C-alpha cells in the first residue's frame, strides 16, 4: 500500500488524540433546535423563511447521522470496520457516500434560495404568474433525488472511496491511481459541479444586490425630496409676511406637489393605473394644489396677507393624507434589506468554506508527484473533510444571532 | 357649437385717447372657462395683456397695462371688455382673445387651445 | 413671469430631413409647456401641450422630449408646408404665462 496506508488499519492512534467533536455535536443540536422553535413558533411553522428553515432541518438530520458514529468509532479503539461487522468496507462506503450526497444538497439548496430571491426581487410579473409557495417548498426533495443519484455512481458503475488517517475518515479517492477512464472522471467532475454551482450563486447574489439599490434610488429621486421641498417651502412662508415671497413660493409648492402626484410606491408599482390605492395618492395631492390655488387667488391677488388658515389647512392636509404611504415604502426597503443581508452571508459562509477540497481535487488530477507521506503533508483530506464537517455547525447559530435585535439594528445604523 | 372668440372694436384713434375692446365668445359658459387677452406686435413675438375669471370675479393685470387698462366682463352678454385710456405710441398691435379651463384635470392642462383672429389697433398723430 | 429661451432664431433646412429645437425655462415649471405654429398674418396654433402629449389634429411629425428643465421639439420628415415660425411658452399660474421669441425654418439652396 504506496498510498493510502491507512486502510483495513485496525489501531485508529496513527491521527488525533483528542475529543472535541462531542461539543461541536451539542453546540449544533442545541442551536439547530432553538432556530427551528423560533422559526416555527413565530411564523406558524414567506418563501424565503421556508427555504430556510427546510435548509436548517436538512442540516441537522444530517449532522446527527455522521457525528455519533465518527465519536463511536474513536471511543471504542476500532476503525471503520472493525467496531461492527460491516464486510468488505460495508460502512466506509456509507459514510463517504452520506457525507457527500448531504454536502451537494446542501450547495443545491443555497443555489435555489438566491435563485429565487434573485427572481422574486427582479422580475415581479414573472414571480407572482410562476412561482407559488408548494415549488418553494419542494426544493429539497428534488435536490435529495438528484444528489443521490449522482452520488450512486459506484453502485452502478465505477467509483472508489478510500479511507484517509486516521481509522475512520472516508471520502473519495482523488491521488495516485495511476490512471483510470472511471476513477479521475468523478474527482474531476465533483469541484467542477461545485465550483459551477456556487458561481451561480454567487451571480444571483450580485443582481439581487444591484436590482434593490435601483428601488431605492427611485424612490429617494421621487417621493421624497419633493416631501422636503414642500416642508421647507410651507416652513419658510410663515417666518415672513411680505407681499413678494407668499405668490412665488406657493408655486414653487404647486410645482413639488405636482411633481410628487408622479411618484409610485414600490409594491403599488405592480398595479399602477387605476389603483385605489394611488387613486387616494393623487386625491390627495389634487386637495392639496387646491388649498394652494385657494391660497393664491382668494388671499394673494390684491395685496391683503393673512395666509395662515391656509397654511395650517395645508399642514392638516400633509399630516393627515400622504404620511402613511411613506412610513409603510421605508419599513418595506428595511425589510427586504435585512432579507438579502441575511442571504449574503450564508452564500459567502459556504463558498468560503468550499476551496480547499477543490483545489486539493484538482490538486490530485493534472499535478502528479505520485509521493505520499511528503514532508508529513497529507493533512489537506484532513482538512477539507472537517471544513464540509464544520459548514454544519456554523449555519443556524449565525441566523438565530443576526435574528436577535438586541444589535442588529444598532450596528446598520451607525454603520 | 365651435370655440370661436369673435373680436369688435378695432380702428385708428388719436394718442392719449380711450378705446374699448369687445371679445364675444361661442359655444361655451365664460362664467366656465377663463379669458386672457394676448397681443401682437407688427413683426415681432407674442404678449399677455390681462385675465379675468367670471366665476370667482378676479382680474390681474400685466406690469405695462395695470392702472390703465379696465377688463370686465358680463354673463348675461357672455361678453368680455378691455377699457384704454392711456395709449402711448408702443401699443399698435393685433389683439385676440384666448380662453382657459380651471383646475383640476384635462382642462387645465390644455393651455391656450383655441384663439381669436385679433383686431387691429393704431395710434398715430 | 418664468423666462423660456429659444435657439436657434433661424434654420435653413432641405426637405425630408429632421430637425430639432430646445427650449430652455428659466425654472422647475414641472410638465407645463406648450409649442405654437404660427405663419406670417395668422393667428398661432398649438402642437404640443403638457411638454410631451400631442394635441388632437396635430401630425405625428412633432414630438416633444423633457429632459428636467430642458423641452425639445423635433420634426421628423420636413414637409413643405412646415416652414412656418415655433414659439414655446411656459404657465404655471393664470398670471404665470411667458412665451418664447420664436424660430423660422426656410429652404435650402
Known amino acids: 500500500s504506496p498510498f493510502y496506508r491507512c486502510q483495513n488499519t485496525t489501531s485508529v492512534e496513527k491521527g488525533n488524540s483528542a475529543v472535541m467533536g462531542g461539543v461541536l455535536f451539542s453546540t449544533g443540536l442545541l442551536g439547530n433546535l432553538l432556530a427551528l422553535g423560533l422559526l416555527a413558533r413565530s411564523g406558524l411553522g414567506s418563501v424565503f423563511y421556508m427555504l430556510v428553515c427546510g435548509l436548517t432541518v436538512t442540516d441537522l438530520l444530517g449532522k446527527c447521522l455522521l457525528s455519533p458514529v465518527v465519536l463511536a468509532a474513536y471511543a471504542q479503539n476500532r476503525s471503520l470496520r472493525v467496531l461492527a461487522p460491516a464486510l468488505d468496507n460495508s460502512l466506509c462506503q456509507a459514510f463517504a457516500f452520506f457525507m457527500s450526497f448531504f454536502g451537494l444538497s446542501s450547495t443545491l439548496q443555497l443555489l435555489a434560495m438566491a435563485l429565487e430571491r434573485w427572481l422574486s426581487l427582479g422580475h415581479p410579473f414573472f414571480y407572482r404568474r410562476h412561482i407559488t409557495l408548494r415549488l418553494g417548498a419542494l426544493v429539497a426533495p428534488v435536490v435529495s433525488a438528484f444528489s443521490l443519484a449522482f452520488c450512486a455512481l459506484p453502485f452502478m458503475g465505477f467509483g472508489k472511496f478510500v479511507q484517509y488517517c486516521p481509522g475512520t475518515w472516508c471520502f473519495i479517492q482523488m491521488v495516485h491511481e495511476e490512471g483510470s477512464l472511471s476513477v479521475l472522471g468523478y474527482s474531476v467532475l465533483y469541484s467542477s459541479l461545485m465550483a459551477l454551482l456556487v458561481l451561480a450563486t454567487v451571480l444571483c447574489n450580485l443582481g439581487a444586490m444591484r436590482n434593490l439599490y435601483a428601488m431605492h434610488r427611485r424612490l429617494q429621486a421621487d417621493l421624497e425630496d419633493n416631501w422636503e421641498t414642500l416642508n421647507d417651502n410651507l416652513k419658510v412662508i410663515e417666518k415672513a409676511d411680505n407681499a413678494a415671497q407668499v405668490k412665488d413660493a406657493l408655486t414653487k409648492m404647486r410645482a413639488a406637489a405636482l411633481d410628487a402626484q408622479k411618484a409610485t410606491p414600490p409594491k403599488l408599482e405592480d398595479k399602477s393605473p387605476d389603483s385605489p390605492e394611488m387613486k387616494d395618492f393623487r386625491h390627495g395631492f389634487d386637495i392639496l394644489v387646491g388649498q394652494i390655488d385657494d391660497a393664491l387667488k382668494l388671499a394673494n391677488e390684491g395685496k391683503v396677507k393673512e395666509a395662515q388658515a391656509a397654511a395650517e389647512q395645508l399642514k392638516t392636509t400633509r399630516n393627515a393624507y400622504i404620511q402613511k404611504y411613506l412610513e409603510r415604502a421605508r419599513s418595506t426597503l428595511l425589510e427586504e434589506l435585512d432579507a438579502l443581508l441575511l442571504l449574503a452571508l450564508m452564500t459567502v459562509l459556504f463558498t468560503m468554506c468550499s476551496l480547499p477540497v477543490i483545489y486539493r481535487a484538482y490538486y490530485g488530477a493534472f499535478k502528479d508527484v505520485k509521493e505520499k507521506n511528503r514532508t508529513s503533508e497529507e493533512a489537506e483530506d484532513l482538512r477539507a473533510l472537517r471544513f464540509l464537517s464544520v459548514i454544519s455547525i456554523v449555519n443556524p447559530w449565525i441566523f438565530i444571532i443576526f435574528r436577535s435585535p438586541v444589535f442588529r439594528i444598532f450596528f446598520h445604523k451607525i454603520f | 357649437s365651435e370655440v370661436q372668440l369673435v373680436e369688435s372694436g378695432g380702428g385708428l384713434v388719436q394718442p392719449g385717447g380711450s378705446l374699448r375692446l369687445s371679445c364675444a365668445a361661442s359655444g361655451f359658459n365664460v362664467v366656465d372657462f377663463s379669458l386672457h387677452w394676448v397681443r401682437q406686435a407688427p413683426g415681432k413675438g407674442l404678449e399677455w395683456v390681462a385675465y379675468?375669471?367670471?366665476?370667482?370675479?378676479?382680474?390681474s393685470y400685466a406690469d405695462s397695462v395695470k392702472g390703465r387698462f379696465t377688463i370686465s366682463a358680463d354673463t348675461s352678454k357672455n361678453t368680455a371688455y378691455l377699457q384704454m385710456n392711456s395709449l402711448r405710441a408702443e401699443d399698435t398691435a393685433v389683439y385676440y382673445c384666448?380662453?382657459?379651463?380651471?383646475?383640476?384635470?384635462?382642462?387645465?392642462?390644455?393651455?391656450?387651445?383655441?384663439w381669436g383672429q385679433g383686431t387691429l389697433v393704431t395710434v398715430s398723430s | 413671469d418664468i423666462q423660456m429661451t429659444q435657439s436657434p432664431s433661424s434654420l435653413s433646412a432641405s426637405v425630408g430631413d429632421r430637425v430639432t429645437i430646445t427650449c430652455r425655462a428659466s425654472?422647475?415649471?414641472?410638465?407645463?409647456v406648450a409649442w405654437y405654429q404660427q405663419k406670417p398674418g395668422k393667428a398661432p396654433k398649438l402642437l404640443i401641450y403638457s411638454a410631451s402629449s400631442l394635441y388632437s389634429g396635430v401630425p405625428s411629425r412633432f414630438s416633444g422630449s423633457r429632459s428636467g428643465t430642458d423641452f425639445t421639439l423635433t420634426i421628423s420628415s420636413l414637409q413643405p408646408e412646415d416652414f412656418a415660425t415655433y414659439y414655446c411658452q411656459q404657465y404655471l399660474y393664470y398670471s404665470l404665462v411667458t412665451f418664447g421669441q420664436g424660430t423660422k425654418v426656410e429652404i435650402k439652396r
Open positions: 425654472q422647475s415649471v414641472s410638465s407645463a
Open positions: 384666448a380662453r382657459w379651463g380651471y383646475w383640476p384635470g384635462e382642462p387645465w392642462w390644455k393651455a391656450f387651445d383655441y
Open positions: 379675468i375669471s367670471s366665476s370667482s370675479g378676479s382680474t
